[PDB]
Every structure is written in structure tokens, then in C-alpha cells.
Write a protein that binds this ligand. Sequence first.
Ligand SMILES: Cc1ccc(NC(=O)OC[C@]23CN(S(=O)(=O)c4ccc(C(C)(C)C)cc4)C[C@H]2C[C@H]2C[C@@H]3C2(C)C)cc1
Length: 365
Amino acid sequence: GIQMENSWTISKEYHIDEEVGFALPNPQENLPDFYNDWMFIAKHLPDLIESGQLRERVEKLNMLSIDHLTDHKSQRLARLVLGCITMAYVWGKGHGDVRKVLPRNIAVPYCQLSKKLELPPILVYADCVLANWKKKDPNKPLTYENMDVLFSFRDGDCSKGFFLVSLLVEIAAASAIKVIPTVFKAMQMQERDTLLKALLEIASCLEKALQVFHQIHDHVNPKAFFSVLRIYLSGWKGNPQLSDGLVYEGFWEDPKEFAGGSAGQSSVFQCFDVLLGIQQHAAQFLQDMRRYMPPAHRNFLCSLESNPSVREFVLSKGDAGLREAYDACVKALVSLRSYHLQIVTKYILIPASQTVRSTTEKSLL
Ligand SMILES: Cc1ccc(NC(=O)OC[C@]23CN(S(=O)(=O)c4ccc(C(C)(C)C)cc4)C[C@H]2C[C@H]2C[C@@H]3C2(C)C)cc1
């Protein structure tokens, strides 16, 4: 089911980089001069929100056409800019003074760009993480030390720690995604060792991805996350503060509901759920968040579901090494989901005070 570019590498239409996976490779940092007013607001979001200046600065913008964003990277950068501006405009300082209408000079170009990219007109994982990063030194490896985000909402919102640790988890998982064609090849060729080493490589990369996930505690403070950053990742779908949604002035007449951030927007959980056949109203929210992933990445997840099952192949072999390599992959994925629930508990549930994991742990044998 996976379309191949050649005998080794999956098709470029999936937009999956060998080094950074679902992340956008070498994101664009600067827009054309034509868009300098957008870039100024987005780069000054912290001080503009703090000073109460953001909303009126947005209301003074002129209408800028999207016709000059001529390539994928420039359009993804513009989506990140307009997306951050939009979140900052709707929520403001996050105290309760919300805006239920997005001015047209942002809404129209934002919604037109989102239409081109087939993404909802709201900030999504693919914006604020997958495309929101740069290398400090191009000649040095992808490390926290050597990386930075492009945009933040409030000084001290820990957006670098939160977004970059997430990104580095995605990059660790990239080293596992590149092995997927080897898994299916080894199954058609009945190559025991090739499949075994592929599965152990995937397990090793997902375990490294968990070790990267651990870094979150060193760069994100629970209070700052729950009280500040979480605000700007919140949406207008089932939100009592925007019960009917947001009016995109000049694009739709009626308000429209779009969901805020969710860990389900990372294609990593589903990619290896499907590969390992450890797939689970929650299925309705899972599929919905799939439509918040980049379209090419949805198509990769779907092509994966059309390949033969690795679980079945492995358990029919009477092959302890293959079963233990498969189990190491599932265990790695279950541990990532456990840690996501631990982070939800420490960074949302506890500060608020003051089942996917089960389906996956069931499919171990
Ligand atoms: C817009 C937006 C903003 C951020 C995100 N983040 C996201 O999808 O992260 C994926 C994670 C889960 N988190 S998390 O810290 O548990 C985590 C916890 C909560 C959230 C929100 C605030 C959205 C509810 C987000 C993330 C870290 C990251 C690392 C590992 C585990 C998966 C991973 C890649 C496999 C999505 C939408």
C-alpha cells in the first residue's frame, strides 16, 4: 500500500523526511518583504499581548494577498504566523476577554492559505511544532542546545521547551519511520533476520524517543504551562467561551468550530499503532484529529493500514526473537503513551486541582 519512490525510500508525496520524519525539514524562517507586517506582529507577540497592544495592531493591518507565497515552505511559515496571531487575538491575555470575530485582513488570507494546505483555520501541531523551529548553527546536529523555536506567545510560557522537546521526540521517531519499508520487504521475502533487525531498530528508536520525552521537565514548568501556554493552544469547539465558534470575517458568514491542540495530532502514535496492529466516540475524536494532520501524512497512515499485518506474521513463526522484537516495539509505544498520561496528570490535572494505552498493552503477545 505504501507508494515507493524507489526500491529503498517511500514516495516523496507522503512528505516524510528521512532525517526529521513528520516534521518539516529546514523550515523557512523569513517571509518575503511583502509580509513584513505579519512577521513583526508574530515575532512581537509576547510584548504585544503583555502591553494590550496586539488586538488593535491586528485591526490596523492591511489586506495582504497570499499569491506571493509560492512554495510549500513559505505557505507553512505563513500559516504558523497567521495561526499564532489568530490564537493571540482570540484569547488575548487569557483572563476571559475573548474575541468572537477574527478581522478579515487576517481571516481571509489565513482561511485561503488553510484551504490550499487542507488544514483547519486554527493553530495545529504541524504549525507550532513541526514547522516552528530552526538550527542555531547549520553545521551542528539537531539538539536542544543547537535549536530554537520561531514563535512564542508569552515570555515565560515555556513554548521553546514544550514545542522543541516535542519536535525532538518526532525526530527520534523519524529514525524508526525510515525502517518501515524494510519491515514489509522482509515479510514478502521471508527474511527472518531482516525483519528481526528492522523491528529491533524501530524499538530502539522509540525508546530513545521516550528518553527525549523525559527532557520536558527540564524546560517546562507546570504552572506556566497550565496557566499560560495552554490558553493559546485552546480552541473553539465545545468551548463555552465560544459556544458557536469563531467568525472568520470575510470568509464565512456563520461562526465555525475548530478544535484546539491534542496529542492525537501527532502522526507518531497512529503510525506505529497501525504498523504493529495494536490499533484500538474516542474513535470519532481520534479520526477527527487525523484531519488536523497534514493531508499527505493522513495518506501515509491510510496506506499503512493497507499493508499486511506484522503482528500476525510474527506470531506464526514460532520465532522467539521476532516475537520479542515485536513486543519491544509495542512496549516502547505503550511507554510513550504512559508518559503522555503522566505529563497530562502533572501539567494539566494537578494544576487544575490547585484507554488507548490499554488497547495497545492488550495487543502484546
Ligand atoms: C496545538 C498543539 C500543540 C501541541 C501538540 N502536541 C502534541 O501533539 O504532542 C505530541 C506528544 C505529546 N506531548 S505532551 O507533552 O504529552 C502534550 C500534552 C498536552 C498537549 C495539549 C496542550 C495540546 C493538550 C500537547 C502535548 C509531547 C509530544 C511528545 C511525544 C508524545 C507525543 C509525541 C510526539 C509522540 C499538539 C497540538
